[model samples]
Target chain A: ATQGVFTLPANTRFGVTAFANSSGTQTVNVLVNNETAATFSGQSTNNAVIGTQVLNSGSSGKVQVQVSVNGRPSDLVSAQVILTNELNFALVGSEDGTDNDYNDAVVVINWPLG
Target chain B: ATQGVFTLPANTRFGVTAFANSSGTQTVNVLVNNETAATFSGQSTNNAVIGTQVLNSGSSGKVQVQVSVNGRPSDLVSAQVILTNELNFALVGSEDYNDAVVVINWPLG
Candidate 1:
């Protein structure tokens, strides 16, 4: 699990990677304000990346990250990645797995934050 | 809020329905074992159905269901639906919304 905080200026980017293994094929999903943002099928690869940016005119909402495996969910890894109209701040959060092993990570603005 | 536990049988089925509203024509995504299981586009409607089953010999794993509105994810509703080699069980979990109403539901096999 991983979390990130962001202070927006322009097209601030947020990226997440899902490490899918023998656990089976799972979906890498991004959420904002408890809603879906973006998702991609993560094959049994090392780390599959999915991401988007908070545009200068993007709406204000809480940025959350999670993974769904075989139609169920893992513990939600969330962070207050961005604040409305705030120009400079930090994005961060924690990451964990049921197996207690490294399975995924979240980064904001190309930095391995949170 | 809904949650159910299950014991497996011959051909057990699992299903999830998502209701899409003005919250940006969200995506109904299903994940399992940190991997992709299925996905569909949830148009603005009442409730959309997406489901599958656990065959008599399907592997055991947690069933986590979720919906993504406008490319963002909502809180995931999960239930430990099945255990390996265990037959005949009930599946259940809870539901809540960011807009404070209802948006998605999860059913199990």
Candidate 2:
């Protein structure tokens, strides 16, 4: 299980941009700290905000993206830092049988970071 | 601060490939679970296995790469999915002012 998490920046936004791994019918969940903020099974709500939260101080809020077979984790999780105050996470699992493209599920964590 | 952790396979190897961030003289550390495995101050020891471990089963082991201004953490951490059961992470920090490329490789298949 390759679990992934990101430290927030006081105020942060979590959103899903794409869900092309339909082969596995995987599900993606956005979590703040330990709270489930949003869940999606398809692209019906693509490019949408799952949830926005006001988090801790310098330590920021803890954000995690969970992907399931419709539960569990991915084989390889790609976490990229983008837009200065933002980080994007991509999950590639046995869901689509590891096609080498880590775009099974992609989520973005945007923060009003300094 | 950007924090990254990689869940590993049965037997895994951690190593450093490049330290082009020479502009900052930054440092990189590879941690297995919670133990410090390797630390690099420059390209002097480039392309070397910092450490290796035999970890848990289906739940695999946990690996983390830490970059410091000699102390804190990087502003940006790029974790990429490389080969099967492998990952590559790049970090850019406010050290040496900025724009130093620090890349590391890990094979956890």
Candidate 3:
């Protein structure tokens, strides 16, 4: 129903986090149960750091997040994390610089509900 | 588009763990959807234990876990997990050292 999530099961509580690699103002979006629940933006002087978000109680079928920065000649960064539970998940990352296209993606479904 | 997620959906799964506070193999990189994906490592005279990961597919992504050292730096260890599924997630952890850093980062669009 939204961008990022294909099909999530019912009643899931997950955590989300984001960070700023380059220095500049940027916008980070958190989508919970198909709704834009929050946003994180970096300041001009200080870039964003690693942070987390919690998605509690709901059955929207999936989860998704969108990130974007404000600059013409910008560099790209990567994010990493470990989840407490196993899941059927997909990740698609993109950029707009040289070699900055939606070319990297990984989708895996860890089944057998825990 | 890459940074902390501002929005996410319901059917979301979340969890994370990091250990070996400050021994030799300090840098970790693991992708375990569930606990059995043994892409892990450690030292010869290790001091850690009870590392776990989960992301059940049948969906109410509400998951929680408890941890205890299975050693002492000279004894204990830790674990970390992530799902390929885009997550609206957060991680909470602490280590016995110089303000242990739970470095969590992800990019999505």
Best by TM-score: 3
Write model 1 residue lDDT over B3-108, tens digit each, in one string: 2223333232433333332334655555554345666564432222222222121365444455556656555333231211221122222222311111111112
lDDT of 1 at B71: 55
lDDT of 2 by residue, A2-106 (tens): 445665554543323223323455566666668876666653112122222323322346666676654556544645454244333322222335555344443
State which candidate, 2 or 3, has the greater DockQ.
3
Among the numbered candidates, top DockQ falls to 3
Q: Which number leads on lDDT?
A: 2
Ranking by TM-score: 3, 2, 1
lDDT order, best first, reads 2, 1, 3
lDDT string, candidate 1, A1-114, tens digits: 343323333333333333333235655555654566667565442322233333121365345545566666654333232122221222222223454322333222221111
Clashes of 1: 57
* Backbone clashes in model 2, listed as residue pairs: A68-A71
Instruction: Categorize the docking of model 2.
Output: incorrect
Query: What is the Cα-based lDDT of residue B96 in candidate 2?
Result: 31
List residue ranges in candidate 1 displaced over 4 A: A1-13, A16-19, A48-57, A76-97, A104-114, B1-109
lDDT of prediction 2: 0.42
For each candidate, what's the DockQ?
0.02, 0.02, 0.05
For candidate 2, write residues B2-109 as lDDT tens digits.
Answer: 445655454544333323223344565666667776665652212121222222222246666666655566654544454344333333232332222333333322
Point out the higher-scoring one by lDDT: 1 or 2: 2
